[PDB]
Ligand binder design. Structure first.
Ligand SMILES: O=C(O)CCCC[C@@H]1SC[C@@H]2NC(=O)N[C@@H]21
Ligand SMILES: O=C(O)CCCC[C@@H]1SC[C@@H]2NC(=O)N[C@@H]21
Ligand SMILES: O=C(O)CCCC[C@@H]1SC[C@@H]2NC(=O)N[C@@H]21
Ligand SMILES: O=C(O)CCCC[C@@H]1SC[C@@H]2NC(=O)N[C@@H]21
Lengths: 121, 121, 121, 121
Protein backbone atom coordinates (compact mmCIF):
# COMPACT_ATOMS: atom_id res chain seq x y z
CA UNK A 1 0.00 0.00 0.00
CA UNK A 2 3.03 2.26 0.27
CA UNK A 3 3.77 2.23 -3.46
CA UNK A 4 0.38 3.21 -4.89
CA UNK A 5 0.16 6.93 -5.67
CA UNK A 6 2.07 9.80 -7.21
CA UNK A 7 5.85 10.11 -7.13
CA UNK A 8 8.19 12.91 -8.23
CA UNK A 9 11.87 12.68 -9.18
CA UNK A 10 14.79 15.10 -9.08
CA UNK A 11 14.24 16.08 -12.75
CA UNK A 12 10.67 17.22 -12.16
CA UNK A 13 9.10 14.10 -13.69
CA UNK A 14 5.90 12.60 -12.31
CA UNK A 15 5.02 8.88 -11.86
CA UNK A 16 1.43 7.73 -10.94
CA UNK A 17 1.23 4.07 -10.13
CA UNK A 18 -1.15 1.47 -8.78
CA UNK A 19 0.38 -1.52 -7.05
CA UNK A 20 -1.85 -4.57 -7.39
CA UNK A 21 -2.19 -7.13 -4.60
CA UNK A 22 -0.19 -9.79 -6.43
CA UNK A 23 2.67 -7.78 -7.85
CA UNK A 24 1.46 -5.69 -10.78
CA UNK A 25 2.45 -2.06 -11.35
CA UNK A 26 0.38 -0.01 -13.76
CA UNK A 27 0.16 3.69 -14.36
CA UNK A 28 1.45 6.69 -16.27
CA UNK A 29 4.74 8.55 -16.47
CA UNK A 30 5.37 12.16 -17.48
CA UNK A 31 9.00 13.12 -18.12
CA UNK A 32 10.19 16.69 -17.58
CA UNK A 33 13.13 16.08 -19.92
CA UNK A 34 14.01 14.43 -23.21
CA UNK A 35 11.98 13.66 -26.30
CA UNK A 36 8.76 13.41 -24.35
CA UNK A 37 5.49 15.27 -24.01
CA UNK A 38 2.44 14.31 -21.97
CA UNK A 39 1.73 11.01 -20.18
CA UNK A 40 3.07 7.59 -21.24
CA UNK A 41 1.83 4.16 -20.22
CA UNK A 42 3.91 2.28 -17.69
CA UNK A 43 3.80 -1.27 -16.51
CA UNK A 44 5.99 -3.24 -14.13
CA UNK A 45 6.23 -5.63 -11.20
CA UNK A 46 7.08 -5.44 -7.51
CA UNK A 47 7.70 -7.88 -4.67
CA UNK A 48 4.29 -8.15 -3.01
CA UNK A 49 5.67 -9.92 0.08
CA UNK A 50 8.90 -8.12 0.94
CA UNK A 51 11.13 -8.92 3.88
CA UNK A 52 10.08 -7.35 7.20
CA UNK A 53 13.58 -6.69 8.54
CA UNK A 54 13.99 -3.10 7.29
CA UNK A 55 14.89 -4.12 3.75
CA UNK A 56 13.34 -2.24 0.84
CA UNK A 57 10.76 -3.60 -1.57
CA UNK A 58 12.26 -4.57 -4.95
CA UNK A 59 10.44 -3.31 -8.05
CA UNK A 60 10.82 -2.28 -11.67
CA UNK A 61 8.84 -0.75 -14.51
CA UNK A 62 9.06 0.17 -18.20
CA UNK A 63 7.91 3.09 -20.33
CA UNK A 64 8.03 2.95 -24.14
CA UNK A 65 8.21 6.56 -25.30
CA UNK A 66 5.28 6.45 -27.72
CA UNK A 67 2.00 8.19 -26.89
CA UNK A 68 -0.63 10.45 -28.47
CA UNK A 69 1.89 13.28 -28.92
CA UNK A 70 5.24 11.78 -29.89
CA UNK A 71 7.26 8.68 -30.61
CA UNK A 72 10.90 8.81 -29.54
CA UNK A 73 11.64 5.22 -30.65
CA UNK A 74 13.03 4.44 -27.22
CA UNK A 75 12.15 2.75 -23.93
CA UNK A 76 13.32 3.17 -20.35
CA UNK A 77 13.33 0.64 -17.54
CA UNK A 78 13.74 1.63 -13.92
CA UNK A 79 14.98 -0.94 -11.42
CA UNK A 80 15.03 -0.16 -7.72
CA UNK A 81 13.46 -0.43 -4.33
CA UNK A 82 10.74 1.27 -2.35
CA UNK A 83 11.70 2.43 1.15
CA UNK A 84 8.73 3.24 3.36
CA UNK A 85 8.35 5.46 6.40
CA UNK A 86 7.96 9.19 6.97
CA UNK A 87 10.27 10.21 4.12
CA UNK A 88 9.39 7.41 1.74
CA UNK A 89 11.40 6.97 -1.45
CA UNK A 90 11.74 4.87 -4.53
CA UNK A 91 15.44 4.70 -5.32
CA UNK A 92 16.20 3.62 -8.86
CA UNK A 93 18.71 3.10 -11.60
CA UNK A 94 17.50 3.16 -15.18
CA UNK A 95 18.43 2.05 -18.69
CA UNK A 96 17.15 4.02 -21.69
CA UNK A 97 17.51 2.11 -24.97
CA UNK A 98 16.92 3.79 -28.32
CA UNK A 99 16.20 1.85 -31.48
CA UNK A 100 19.43 2.05 -33.50
CA UNK A 101 21.06 0.61 -36.58
CA UNK A 102 23.29 -2.37 -35.96
CA UNK A 103 26.39 -0.21 -36.54
CA UNK A 104 25.24 2.16 -33.79
CA UNK A 105 24.00 -0.46 -31.32
CA UNK A 106 27.10 0.04 -29.16
CA UNK A 107 25.72 3.50 -28.27
CA UNK A 108 22.05 2.48 -27.93
CA UNK A 109 21.71 2.61 -24.15
CA UNK A 110 21.98 5.40 -21.60
CA UNK A 111 22.23 4.69 -17.87
CA UNK A 112 21.23 6.91 -14.99
CA UNK A 113 19.56 7.13 -11.61
CA UNK A 114 16.35 8.70 -10.35
CA UNK A 115 15.18 9.18 -6.79
CA UNK A 116 11.42 9.50 -6.31
CA UNK A 117 9.67 11.10 -3.36
CA UNK A 118 6.04 11.73 -2.46
CA UNK A 119 6.50 15.53 -2.60
CA UNK A 120 7.85 17.73 -5.45
CA UNK A 121 11.55 18.74 -5.49
CA UNK B 1 4.61 -9.53 -34.90
CA UNK B 2 8.32 -10.30 -34.69
CA UNK B 3 8.46 -10.07 -30.90
CA UNK B 4 5.63 -12.43 -29.91
CA UNK B 5 6.88 -15.92 -29.06
CA UNK B 6 9.58 -17.78 -27.18
CA UNK B 7 13.11 -16.47 -26.74
CA UNK B 8 16.24 -18.07 -25.24
CA UNK B 9 19.32 -16.35 -23.81
CA UNK B 10 22.97 -17.33 -23.44
CA UNK B 11 22.38 -18.56 -19.85
CA UNK B 12 19.73 -21.06 -20.89
CA UNK B 13 16.81 -18.94 -19.68
CA UNK B 14 13.49 -18.87 -21.53
CA UNK B 15 11.21 -15.84 -22.21
CA UNK B 16 7.64 -16.28 -23.65
CA UNK B 17 6.03 -13.01 -24.58
CA UNK B 18 2.99 -11.60 -26.32
CA UNK B 19 3.36 -8.19 -27.92
CA UNK B 20 0.03 -6.37 -27.97
CA UNK B 21 -0.96 -4.11 -30.86
CA UNK B 22 -0.54 -0.91 -28.85
CA UNK B 23 2.68 -1.58 -27.00
CA UNK B 24 2.07 -4.07 -24.20
CA UNK B 25 4.40 -6.98 -23.39
CA UNK B 26 3.07 -9.77 -21.23
CA UNK B 27 4.33 -13.25 -20.55
CA UNK B 28 6.48 -15.48 -18.39
CA UNK B 29 10.19 -15.81 -17.69
CA UNK B 30 12.13 -18.85 -16.50
CA UNK B 31 15.70 -18.22 -15.34
CA UNK B 32 18.34 -20.95 -15.60
CA UNK B 33 20.40 -19.24 -12.90
CA UNK B 34 20.05 -17.47 -9.58
CA UNK B 35 17.49 -17.71 -6.82
CA UNK B 36 14.76 -18.77 -9.19
CA UNK B 37 12.65 -21.82 -9.92
CA UNK B 38 9.79 -22.16 -12.38
CA UNK B 39 8.01 -19.41 -14.35
CA UNK B 40 7.64 -15.78 -13.23
CA UNK B 41 5.23 -13.15 -14.50
CA UNK B 42 6.66 -10.50 -16.79
CA UNK B 43 5.23 -7.28 -18.08
CA UNK B 44 6.71 -4.51 -20.19
CA UNK B 45 6.32 -2.14 -23.13
CA UNK B 46 7.67 -1.85 -26.67
CA UNK B 47 7.59 0.71 -29.47
CA UNK B 48 4.64 -0.42 -31.58
CA UNK B 49 5.56 1.85 -34.51
CA UNK B 50 9.33 1.60 -34.86
CA UNK B 51 11.41 3.34 -37.50
CA UNK B 52 11.57 1.58 -40.88
CA UNK B 53 15.17 2.48 -41.71
CA UNK B 54 16.87 -0.64 -40.31
CA UNK B 55 16.77 0.56 -36.71
CA UNK B 56 15.77 -1.89 -33.99
CA UNK B 57 12.55 -1.80 -31.98
CA UNK B 58 13.03 -0.40 -28.47
CA UNK B 59 11.50 -2.40 -25.61
CA UNK B 60 11.78 -3.28 -21.94
CA UNK B 61 10.25 -5.59 -19.35
CA UNK B 62 10.33 -6.44 -15.64
CA UNK B 63 10.23 -9.64 -13.60
CA UNK B 64 9.76 -9.57 -9.81
CA UNK B 65 11.27 -12.81 -8.53
CA UNK B 66 8.26 -14.01 -6.55
CA UNK B 67 6.16 -16.94 -7.76
CA UNK B 68 4.52 -20.13 -6.49
CA UNK B 69 7.91 -21.67 -5.61
CA UNK B 70 10.17 -18.93 -4.24
CA UNK B 71 10.57 -15.29 -3.34
CA UNK B 72 14.05 -13.85 -3.90
CA UNK B 73 13.06 -10.32 -2.81
CA UNK B 74 14.45 -8.92 -6.04
CA UNK B 75 13.40 -7.67 -9.47
CA UNK B 76 15.12 -7.45 -12.84
CA UNK B 77 14.45 -5.06 -15.70
CA UNK B 78 15.73 -5.68 -19.20
CA UNK B 79 16.11 -2.75 -21.58
CA UNK B 80 16.99 -3.33 -25.21
CA UNK B 81 15.93 -3.64 -28.79
CA UNK B 82 14.47 -6.26 -31.07
CA UNK B 83 16.29 -6.81 -34.37
CA UNK B 84 14.27 -8.72 -36.94
CA UNK B 85 15.27 -10.80 -39.94
CA UNK B 86 16.55 -14.34 -40.44
CA UNK B 87 18.67 -14.37 -37.27
CA UNK B 88 16.38 -12.27 -35.12
CA UNK B 89 17.57 -11.14 -31.70
CA UNK B 90 16.57 -9.18 -28.67
CA UNK B 91 19.72 -7.50 -27.38
CA UNK B 92 19.46 -6.30 -23.81
CA UNK B 93 21.12 -4.87 -20.77
CA UNK B 94 19.57 -5.53 -17.39
CA UNK B 95 19.46 -4.24 -13.82
CA UNK B 96 18.73 -6.66 -10.96
CA UNK B 97 17.81 -4.87 -7.73
CA UNK B 98 17.52 -6.74 -4.43
CA UNK B 99 15.63 -5.38 -1.46
CA UNK B 100 18.34 -4.27 0.99
CA UNK B 101 18.78 -2.38 4.21
CA UNK B 102 19.62 1.28 3.82
CA UNK B 103 23.23 0.60 4.87
CA UNK B 104 23.56 -1.95 2.07
CA UNK B 105 21.69 -0.02 -0.63
CA UNK B 106 24.98 0.89 -2.33
CA UNK B 107 25.31 -2.80 -3.29
CA UNK B 108 21.63 -3.40 -4.16
CA UNK B 109 21.90 -3.55 -7.95
CA UNK B 110 23.66 -5.89 -10.35
CA UNK B 111 24.09 -5.03 -14.04
CA UNK B 112 24.52 -7.38 -16.96
CA UNK B 113 23.57 -8.17 -20.52
CA UNK B 114 21.52 -10.90 -22.17
CA UNK B 115 21.16 -11.72 -25.84
CA UNK B 116 17.98 -13.57 -26.81
CA UNK B 117 17.48 -15.66 -29.92
CA UNK B 118 14.60 -17.72 -31.29
CA UNK B 119 16.58 -20.98 -30.98
CA UNK B 120 18.33 -22.50 -27.90
CA UNK B 121 22.06 -21.88 -27.33
CA UNK C 1 43.21 22.73 -11.62
CA UNK C 2 39.68 22.21 -10.33
CA UNK C 3 40.02 18.43 -10.02
CA UNK C 4 43.21 18.15 -7.95
CA UNK C 5 42.50 17.71 -4.24
CA UNK C 6 40.31 15.84 -1.80
CA UNK C 7 36.74 14.79 -2.54
CA UNK C 8 34.05 13.20 -0.35
CA UNK C 9 31.02 11.18 -1.43
CA UNK C 10 27.59 10.54 0.07
CA UNK C 11 28.79 7.27 1.69
CA UNK C 12 31.55 8.98 3.65
CA UNK C 13 34.34 7.81 1.34
CA UNK C 14 37.35 10.00 0.57
CA UNK C 15 39.15 10.47 -2.80
CA UNK C 16 42.52 12.36 -3.05
CA UNK C 17 43.59 12.97 -6.59
CA UNK C 18 46.19 14.81 -8.62
CA UNK C 19 45.22 15.81 -12.14
CA UNK C 20 48.28 15.98 -14.39
CA UNK C 21 48.61 18.58 -17.14
CA UNK C 22 48.08 16.07 -19.94
CA UNK C 23 45.25 13.98 -18.60
CA UNK C 24 46.51 11.69 -15.85
CA UNK C 25 44.67 11.07 -12.58
CA UNK C 26 46.59 9.52 -9.71
CA UNK C 27 45.84 9.25 -6.04
CA UNK C 28 44.27 7.22 -3.26
CA UNK C 29 40.75 6.15 -2.35
CA UNK C 30 39.36 5.22 1.06
CA UNK C 31 35.93 3.57 1.08
CA UNK C 32 33.62 3.94 4.07
CA UNK C 33 31.75 0.78 3.04
CA UNK C 34 32.33 -2.71 1.71
CA UNK C 35 35.26 -5.08 1.98
CA UNK C 36 37.75 -2.27 2.33
CA UNK C 37 40.08 -0.85 4.94
CA UNK C 38 42.60 1.95 4.55
CA UNK C 39 43.77 3.67 1.35
CA UNK C 40 43.86 2.06 -2.11
CA UNK C 41 45.76 3.19 -5.19
CA UNK C 42 43.74 4.86 -7.91
CA UNK C 43 44.59 5.80 -11.44
CA UNK C 44 42.54 7.28 -14.25
CA UNK C 45 42.24 9.85 -17.03
CA UNK C 46 40.41 13.12 -17.62
CA UNK C 47 39.81 15.48 -20.52
CA UNK C 48 42.57 18.08 -20.10
CA UNK C 49 41.00 20.49 -22.61
CA UNK C 50 37.27 20.44 -21.90
CA UNK C 51 34.67 22.52 -23.69
CA UNK C 52 34.26 26.09 -22.40
CA UNK C 53 30.50 26.35 -22.92
CA UNK C 54 29.38 25.25 -19.43
CA UNK C 55 29.83 21.55 -20.13
CA UNK C 56 31.46 19.37 -17.49
CA UNK C 57 34.89 17.76 -17.73
CA UNK C 58 34.72 14.04 -18.56
CA UNK C 59 36.84 11.72 -16.42
CA UNK C 60 37.16 8.22 -15.01
CA UNK C 61 39.29 6.21 -12.60
CA UNK C 62 39.81 2.69 -11.25
CA UNK C 63 40.56 1.19 -7.84
CA UNK C 64 41.52 -2.49 -7.45
CA UNK C 65 40.58 -3.42 -3.89
CA UNK C 66 43.94 -4.84 -2.85
CA UNK C 67 46.19 -2.96 -0.42
CA UNK C 68 48.34 -3.53 2.67
CA UNK C 69 45.30 -4.55 4.75
CA UNK C 70 42.95 -6.58 2.55
CA UNK C 71 42.25 -8.06 -0.84
CA UNK C 72 38.59 -8.13 -1.86
CA UNK C 73 39.29 -9.63 -5.32
CA UNK C 74 37.33 -6.83 -6.94
CA UNK C 75 37.75 -3.54 -8.78
CA UNK C 76 35.59 -0.47 -9.23
CA UNK C 77 35.58 2.06 -12.05
CA UNK C 78 33.92 5.44 -11.75
CA UNK C 79 32.89 7.28 -14.90
CA UNK C 80 31.60 10.83 -14.71
CA UNK C 81 32.20 14.52 -15.04
CA UNK C 82 33.64 17.33 -12.98
CA UNK C 83 31.47 20.44 -12.65
CA UNK C 84 33.34 23.49 -11.40
CA UNK C 85 32.19 26.63 -9.63
CA UNK C 86 31.27 27.51 -6.05
CA UNK C 87 29.62 24.16 -5.30
CA UNK C 88 31.92 22.00 -7.37
CA UNK C 89 31.07 18.33 -7.86
CA UNK C 90 32.23 15.17 -9.50
CA UNK C 91 29.11 13.28 -10.55
CA UNK C 92 29.71 9.63 -11.27
CA UNK C 93 28.32 6.23 -12.04
CA UNK C 94 30.38 3.19 -11.13
CA UNK C 95 30.81 -0.50 -11.92
CA UNK C 96 32.20 -2.84 -9.26
CA UNK C 97 33.33 -6.19 -10.70
CA UNK C 98 34.27 -9.10 -8.45
CA UNK C 99 36.38 -12.00 -9.63
CA UNK C 100 33.91 -14.89 -10.02
CA UNK C 101 33.69 -18.40 -11.38
CA UNK C 102 32.38 -18.67 -14.91
CA UNK C 103 29.06 -20.02 -13.62
CA UNK C 104 28.64 -16.91 -11.45
CA UNK C 105 29.90 -14.34 -13.96
CA UNK C 106 26.33 -13.19 -14.65
CA UNK C 107 26.30 -11.72 -11.12
CA UNK C 108 29.87 -10.35 -11.14
CA UNK C 109 29.12 -6.65 -11.48
CA UNK C 110 27.34 -4.13 -9.27
CA UNK C 111 26.32 -0.70 -10.56
CA UNK C 112 25.77 2.48 -8.60
CA UNK C 113 26.33 6.21 -8.44
CA UNK C 114 28.44 8.47 -6.26
CA UNK C 115 28.40 12.24 -6.00
CA UNK C 116 31.61 13.85 -4.75
CA UNK C 117 31.92 17.28 -3.19
CA UNK C 118 34.81 19.27 -1.74
CA UNK C 119 33.28 19.24 1.77
CA UNK C 120 32.15 16.25 3.92
CA UNK C 121 28.48 15.15 3.88
CA UNK D 1 51.33 -12.45 -16.81
CA UNK D 2 48.12 -13.41 -18.59
CA UNK D 3 46.89 -9.83 -18.96
CA UNK D 4 49.92 -8.18 -20.58
CA UNK D 5 49.61 -7.96 -24.36
CA UNK D 6 47.19 -7.10 -27.14
CA UNK D 7 43.44 -7.67 -26.92
CA UNK D 8 40.67 -7.29 -29.51
CA UNK D 9 36.94 -6.75 -28.92
CA UNK D 10 33.80 -7.56 -30.89
CA UNK D 11 33.74 -4.04 -32.43
CA UNK D 12 37.20 -4.38 -33.94
CA UNK D 13 38.90 -2.22 -31.31
CA UNK D 14 42.41 -2.97 -30.07
CA UNK D 15 43.76 -2.75 -26.47
CA UNK D 16 47.55 -3.06 -25.71
CA UNK D 17 48.28 -3.27 -22.03
CA UNK D 18 51.11 -3.92 -19.61
CA UNK D 19 50.18 -5.34 -16.23
CA UNK D 20 52.68 -4.28 -13.58
CA UNK D 21 53.69 -6.59 -10.74
CA UNK D 22 51.79 -4.61 -8.11
CA UNK D 23 48.55 -3.86 -9.89
CA UNK D 24 49.11 -1.17 -12.51
CA UNK D 25 47.63 -1.28 -16.02
CA UNK D 26 49.10 1.02 -18.64
CA UNK D 27 48.82 1.06 -22.38
CA UNK D 28 46.94 2.34 -25.41
CA UNK D 29 43.46 1.86 -26.82
CA UNK D 30 42.29 2.23 -30.42
CA UNK D 31 38.51 2.29 -30.96
CA UNK D 32 37.00 1.08 -34.23
CA UNK D 33 33.86 3.13 -33.56
CA UNK D 34 32.75 6.50 -32.27
CA UNK D 35 34.42 9.89 -32.20
CA UNK D 36 37.88 8.39 -32.13
CA UNK D 37 40.92 8.15 -34.35
CA UNK D 38 44.31 6.65 -33.53
CA UNK D 39 45.64 5.48 -30.15
CA UNK D 40 44.57 6.88 -26.76
CA UNK D 41 46.33 6.56 -23.41
CA UNK D 42 44.84 4.11 -20.95
CA UNK D 43 45.52 3.51 -17.31
CA UNK D 44 43.91 1.22 -14.76
CA UNK D 45 44.34 -1.32 -11.98
CA UNK D 46 43.98 -5.07 -11.55
CA UNK D 47 44.04 -7.55 -8.68
CA UNK D 48 47.65 -8.75 -8.65
CA UNK D 49 46.91 -11.67 -6.30
CA UNK D 50 43.64 -13.16 -7.52
CA UNK D 51 41.93 -16.19 -6.03
CA UNK D 52 43.23 -19.56 -7.26
CA UNK D 53 39.89 -21.38 -7.25
CA UNK D 54 38.90 -20.75 -10.89
CA UNK D 55 37.66 -17.22 -10.25
CA UNK D 56 38.57 -14.48 -12.70
CA UNK D 57 40.95 -11.60 -12.04
CA UNK D 58 39.13 -8.32 -11.36
CA UNK D 59 40.35 -5.25 -13.26
CA UNK D 60 39.37 -1.90 -14.72
CA UNK D 61 40.77 0.88 -16.87
CA UNK D 62 39.95 4.34 -18.25
CA UNK D 63 40.46 6.12 -21.57
CA UNK D 64 39.84 9.87 -21.93
CA UNK D 65 39.09 10.43 -25.61
CA UNK D 66 41.66 13.16 -26.22
CA UNK D 67 44.80 12.46 -28.27
CA UNK D 68 46.91 13.97 -31.05
CA UNK D 69 44.04 13.69 -33.55
CA UNK D 70 40.78 14.48 -31.76
CA UNK D 71 39.07 15.43 -28.54
CA UNK D 72 35.61 13.94 -28.03
CA UNK D 73 35.15 15.48 -24.56
CA UNK D 74 34.33 12.08 -23.14
CA UNK D 75 35.84 9.21 -21.16
CA UNK D 76 35.11 5.50 -20.92
CA UNK D 77 35.78 3.12 -18.05
CA UNK D 78 35.74 -0.63 -18.47
CA UNK D 79 35.16 -2.83 -15.44
CA UNK D 80 35.51 -6.59 -15.69
CA UNK D 81 37.55 -9.69 -15.17
CA UNK D 82 40.29 -11.58 -16.94
CA UNK D 83 39.69 -15.31 -17.47
CA UNK D 84 42.81 -17.25 -18.36
CA UNK D 85 43.33 -20.53 -20.17
CA UNK D 86 43.36 -21.61 -23.81
CA UNK D 87 40.59 -19.24 -24.89
CA UNK D 88 41.46 -16.38 -22.58
CA UNK D 89 39.11 -13.41 -22.32
CA UNK D 90 38.60 -10.11 -20.64
CA UNK D 91 34.87 -9.73 -20.08
CA UNK D 92 33.78 -6.19 -19.40
CA UNK D 93 31.00 -3.71 -18.93
CA UNK D 94 31.70 -0.06 -19.64
CA UNK D 95 30.45 3.45 -18.91
CA UNK D 96 31.07 6.24 -21.42
CA UNK D 97 30.49 9.70 -19.95
CA UNK D 98 30.43 12.81 -22.13
CA UNK D 99 30.94 16.29 -20.76
CA UNK D 100 27.47 17.87 -20.79
CA UNK D 101 25.62 20.92 -19.59
CA UNK D 102 23.85 20.51 -16.28
CA UNK D 103 20.47 20.39 -18.06
CA UNK D 104 21.70 17.46 -20.16
CA UNK D 105 23.55 15.58 -17.43
CA UNK D 106 20.74 13.02 -17.20
CA UNK D 107 21.81 11.78 -20.66
CA UNK D 108 25.59 12.03 -20.10
CA UNK D 109 26.42 8.34 -19.76
CA UNK D 110 26.17 5.38 -22.12
CA UNK D 111 26.51 1.79 -20.88
CA UNK D 112 27.62 -1.26 -22.79
CA UNK D 113 29.70 -4.41 -22.77
CA UNK D 114 32.84 -5.52 -24.56
CA UNK D 115 34.41 -8.95 -24.72
CA UNK D 116 38.14 -9.03 -25.47
CA UNK D 117 40.07 -11.96 -26.86
CA UNK D 118 43.69 -12.52 -27.85
CA UNK D 119 42.78 -13.02 -31.53
CA UNK D 120 40.81 -10.72 -33.90
CA UNK D 121 37.05 -11.26 -34.40
O1 LIG E 1 14.24 11.15 -24.85
C1 LIG E 1 13.67 10.03 -24.89
O2 LIG E 1 14.11 9.08 -25.59
C2 LIG E 1 12.40 9.81 -24.11
C3 LIG E 1 12.38 10.53 -22.75
C4 LIG E 1 13.38 9.92 -21.76
C5 LIG E 1 13.33 10.60 -20.40
C6 LIG E 1 14.31 9.95 -19.42
S1 LIG E 1 13.78 8.37 -18.78
C7 LIG E 1 15.09 8.41 -17.58
C8 LIG E 1 15.13 9.87 -17.07
N1 LIG E 1 14.18 10.06 -15.97
C9 LIG E 1 13.21 10.91 -16.31
O3 LIG E 1 12.25 11.23 -15.59
N2 LIG E 1 13.39 11.36 -17.57
C10 LIG E 1 14.59 10.80 -18.17
O1 LIG F 1 18.66 -14.44 -8.02
C1 LIG F 1 17.68 -13.66 -8.09
O2 LIG F 1 17.59 -12.64 -7.37
C2 LIG F 1 16.55 -13.98 -9.05
C3 LIG F 1 17.02 -14.59 -10.37
C4 LIG F 1 17.80 -13.60 -11.23
C5 LIG F 1 18.23 -14.19 -12.57
C6 LIG F 1 18.97 -13.16 -13.42
S1 LIG F 1 17.92 -11.93 -14.17
C7 LIG F 1 19.28 -11.38 -15.18
C8 LIG F 1 19.99 -12.68 -15.63
N1 LIG F 1 19.37 -13.21 -16.85
C9 LIG F 1 18.81 -14.40 -16.62
O3 LIG F 1 18.18 -15.07 -17.46
N2 LIG F 1 18.98 -14.77 -15.34
C10 LIG F 1 19.74 -13.78 -14.59
O1 LIG G 1 33.56 -4.54 -1.23
C1 LIG G 1 34.42 -4.47 -2.13
O2 LIG G 1 34.50 -5.33 -3.05
C2 LIG G 1 35.44 -3.35 -2.11
C3 LIG G 1 34.88 -2.02 -1.62
C4 LIG G 1 33.88 -1.41 -2.61
C5 LIG G 1 33.35 -0.06 -2.15
C6 LIG G 1 32.38 0.53 -3.19
S1 LIG G 1 33.17 1.20 -4.64
C7 LIG G 1 31.64 1.96 -5.13
C8 LIG G 1 31.03 2.52 -3.82
N1 LIG G 1 31.53 3.86 -3.55
C9 LIG G 1 32.26 3.88 -2.42
O3 LIG G 1 32.84 4.88 -1.97
N2 LIG G 1 32.30 2.66 -1.87
C10 LIG G 1 31.54 1.69 -2.64
O1 LIG H 1 32.68 8.59 -29.24
C1 LIG H 1 33.36 8.86 -28.22
O2 LIG H 1 32.95 9.64 -27.33
C2 LIG H 1 34.75 8.28 -28.08
C3 LIG H 1 34.87 6.84 -28.60
C4 LIG H 1 34.09 5.84 -27.73
C5 LIG H 1 34.24 4.40 -28.22
C6 LIG H 1 33.48 3.43 -27.31
S1 LIG H 1 34.27 3.11 -25.74
C7 LIG H 1 33.14 1.77 -25.45
C8 LIG H 1 33.00 1.05 -26.81
N1 LIG H 1 34.06 0.05 -26.97
C9 LIG H 1 34.87 0.37 -27.98
O3 LIG H 1 35.87 -0.28 -28.32
N2 LIG H 1 34.47 1.50 -28.56
C10 LIG H 1 33.28 2.05 -27.93
Amino acid sequence: AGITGTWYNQLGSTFIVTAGADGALTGTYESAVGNAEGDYVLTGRYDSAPATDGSGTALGWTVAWKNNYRNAHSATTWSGQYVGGAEARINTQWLLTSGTTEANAWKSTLVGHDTFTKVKP
